[PDB]
RNA sequence: GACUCGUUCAUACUACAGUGGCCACACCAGAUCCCAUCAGAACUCUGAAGUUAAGCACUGUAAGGCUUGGCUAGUACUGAGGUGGGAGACCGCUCGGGAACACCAGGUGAUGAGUCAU
RNA sequence: GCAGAUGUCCAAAGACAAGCUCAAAGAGAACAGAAAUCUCUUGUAGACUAAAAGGGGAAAAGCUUGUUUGAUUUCUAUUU
RNA sequence: UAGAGGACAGGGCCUUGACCUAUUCUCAAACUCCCAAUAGGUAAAAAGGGCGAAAUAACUCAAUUUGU
RNA sequence: UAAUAUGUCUAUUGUAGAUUUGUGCCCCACUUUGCAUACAAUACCGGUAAGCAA
């Protein structure tokens, strides 16, 4: 009995879609935001985003506190302003669904859907 | 004008419904011995060692055994005579025959029945009965149970 | 089962049925011919005696046309050495004639081929 | 003029004229290219019996011929 | 549109059970259970080393059509007898289990006298051939410990040195087979802080031993083990569904 | 009681409620290395404070669905015979063989060997 | 006779291993749109697999990555 | 060939479509969930089988004595 | 360059196999011999590979 919402991942969305001379500045501002290196979009080169975890997740959350219609239904929220925001959360025990022992899948009620998302959004 | 290796095998080599996918785990776990009757059934999931155009569903003796392949002696009819042919196929395309299990239990029956019959000195035959005419017996059909039916007209 | 199945494929070219005792006796006595010669050299010969029957079957204690009828009607342990020993009967055409060789004995229209069952005794003794 | 392109007529009748022959079913088949390193071992097996049989027979022959 | 329609549902398939619960890979599985067909009765007895969340497992699997039979499964909780009560998932624990299976099956064969083995760290060997273990290994893993303990007992397994200390480091081999890579963490945390020591090294301090005692107990135990070992039926379902429909006639 | 080596390839799997560890899963928190990963996310490894929350072990849902039995139906179709019918296609007849597309119900089996515990 | 295809192409589009799952649809997201990018759900392949067509393929035979030259020499039993 | 009803777009609560769920009429040499009849193949014991010992091997197996 | 190879005037080995020998001068089963021939197994000769090569 440890039903609670924890934190696993968090990404961004830095998408412009043009030529060079600005990937450097985008990666530089993204590194100053989160110290770690972003990666690109499709390469058929038009977008980029970065991830980092730890207390830096809480720090970027606190930065990103600043509509009530378009919530995500799996605790994986995202938005944007130039910058964007993305964060992946869900209930624990999630790793048996991805571990080499018993790669498996989730049930339904144990997911928190979007009502819990809206409740947690107003609570935070 | 077209006589390729897999010509005319659209349905013969096609995988059956619900049967798609590689062979089962213990299909590789059959004790094949030399001089063993065996059916050769193509498995299109495995491409190497595929049996050739005509020998799908045939049966033959094992004359060769290799690390992952089997040589099968299959008689094929051409023109005016049947001639032997040695086909070398991988073991997923080979299924143990069900011709000799008809006599395996018969030959176990022999060692337990003929032995006791001779040692007690009776004469008993063992040939298959090929039963035709049914014997004569005394029966009891019940007058209550007997019921009548009849044919029907047009409608 | 085996011979009945193999005869069903040839039914439209034959007529067959129950022989009964008097008819088998007539066939053996007046049309019975026997292979007296040596293996594969049989040299068809009419019975006319029991010496050849004893020579081929006396060690097997079924010597005599008495025994051959006694054995052919009720199919006892020796049918191999009786049927195969007996030459194929060469029958005369029917005295009164066939009805229709082209049609089955069982169709409502007149016909001949098929299983006459018990009705073949009259045909045999008419053809004999 | 046009030629008869193909027909299978009379072919199996010609076949059954002399009948559908069968393989002669020899008891032993050559294994010239059949699983090497195993029948080589069988070859080595045979000599083991051969040598003892030959020496025993030769000794018996000499002892009986004096 | 619905993809869950009945025409779709009438075409589904299923997976197979051993991979479906995750013990064999079902491609490595086929590759290990296949052997050359010229070798009849070549049992291919496979040595298996696996890691639980608590201990280490070493087994023998003798291939059969119906299923494999283990002469005995090597246990890391029997090391309590030899001198490892707790710490049964360590590198030294896996090495002890490898020596366990090796020496205990050797005495099952009555061939300890024929193959004594080797002392400490530097006819024909005993049957073993490795299992995949599903996972992806890394250098200096505890999967090596069972294999190397088995080798020191007399066993042999062809197995590459990619996952070996030095990608050849006998010093790291010594640091490994006695598990002292926990002792290095212990020394580093001593100089770092004592805040997490209560939650991390609890039973260790209960046992009242040290870094230089981990190696001592492990070596003593390894020497000791080297020298000596509910349902509802048709009518019930009908009655219950009748009750359910009768109830929902007026329930909601 | 638990697991293990394996199995049988759906009674072994897809839409909802109920139970959960003395020893056994699985969840654990973390990155210092053997070390491997945008990221200790997977993986490795560290030790066990909090957990059955999960998957799942199982139960059950007139669900899916596995499947067979009956019914379709001696219907469709078809081997052999016909100096059979019919202007033809078709349609009988004799000796034989003989399907497929909807519904009611069974519940989601079982395998040897070993260890720990009781 | 009918619908077509071949005289090519590939140091990888060959070999091995690992990881991942594809098409599509729906719901969302600064610039940003029917579509360009990201997240989630469903997703038996409805994608992809050099080419014509037909088979086969989902911890794959597809995508990505790493290492590679077994696209090497010689000889058998053979199938079309 | 057509529907029962129904949360997206367009026009003026209404309309037009698109789309959806279980349904309807009719078809496929190069379409199959299923699937005959006929045709085809293999097996029907002695130069063989079963059952044990002994040997032999440079093969196989941890095995100069496991198996073949 | 050139067909067992000097341990021996037993003259390669098997499975079938014609004939011969007896025992239970003519039926039968066991041993005794093993033509021809067939299917194989072996060696040895010439050539080519592979290993070594003064």
TrEMBL record, chain A:
A GO MF term: rRNA binding
Keywords carried by this UniProt record: Cytoplasm, Nucleus, Ribonucleoprotein, Ribosomal protein, RNA-binding, rRNA-binding
Superkingdom per UniProt: Eukaryota
One Pfam family linked to the record: Ribosomal_L5_C
Gene Ontology CC: cytosolic large ribosomal subunit; nucleus
Stretches assigned to the Large ribosomal subunit protein uL5 N-terminal domain: 1-44
Keyword Repressor attached: no
Domain Large ribosomal subunit protein uL5 C-terminal intervals: 45-120
GO biological process terms held by the UniProt record: translation
Subcellular compartments: Cytoplasm; Nucleus
Family: Belongs to the universal ribosomal protein uL5 family.
NCBIfam families tied to this protein: PRK04219.1 (NF003258)
Name by which UniProt lists this protein: 60S ribosomal protein L11a, putative
TrEMBL record, chain B:
Keyword terms of this UniProt record: Ribonucleoprotein, Ribosomal protein
Family: Belongs to the eukaryotic ribosomal protein eL21 family.
UniProt superkingdom: Eukaryota
GO MF, one annotated term: structural constituent of ribosome
Phylogenetic classification of the source organism: Eukaryota, Sar, Alveolata, Apicomplexa, Aconoidasida
InterPro entries reported in the protein's UniProt record: Ribosomal_eL21 (IPR001147), Ribosomal_eL21_CS (IPR018259), Ribosomal_eL21_sf (IPR036948), Translation_prot_SH3-like_sf (IPR008991)
Gene Ontology cellular-component terms listed: cytosolic large ribosomal subunit
Keyword RNA-binding among UniProt keywords: no
Xref: PROSITE patterns: RIBOSOMAL_L21E
Listed GO biological process terms: translation
Originating species: Plasmodium falciparum (isolate 3D7)
Pfam family, one: Ribosomal_L21e
This protein's name: 60S ribosomal protein L21
TrEMBL record, chain C:
Coiled coil residues, start to end: none
GO BP field: maturation of LSU-rRNA from tricistronic rRNA transcript (SSU-rRNA, 5.8S rRNA, LSU-rRNA); translation
Keyword Ribosomal protein part of the UniProt annotation: yes
GO molecular function: RNA binding; structural constituent of ribosome
Keywords: Ribonucleoprotein, Ribosomal protein
Keyword Ribonucleoprotein: yes
Domain of life of the source: Eukaryota
Gene Ontology CC: cytosolic large ribosomal subunit
Family designation: Belongs to the universal ribosomal protein uL30 family.
UniProt name for this protein: 60S ribosomal protein L7, putative
Source species of the chain: Plasmodium falciparum (isolate 3D7)
Lineage summary: Eukaryota, Sar, Alveolata, Apicomplexa, Aconoidasida
Included range, full protein: 130 to 257 of 257
TrEMBL record, chain E:
GO terms for cellular component: cytosolic large ribosomal subunit; nucleus
SUPFAM superfamilies with a match to the protein in the record: Translational machinery components (SSF53137)
Domain Large ribosomal subunit protein uL18 C-terminal eukaryotes as annotated: residue spans: 214-249
Location of the protein in the cell: Cytoplasm; Nucleus
Keyword Cell division: no
Transmembrane domains' residue ranges: none
Keyword check for Nucleus: yes
GO BP, one annotated term: translation
Keywords, in A-Z order: Cytoplasm, Nucleus, Ribonucleoprotein, Ribosomal protein, RNA-binding
A single MF term (Gene Ontology): 5S rRNA binding
Family, per entry: Belongs to the universal ribosomal protein uL18 family.
Protein name: 60S ribosomal protein L5, putative
Species of the source: Plasmodium falciparum (isolate 3D7)
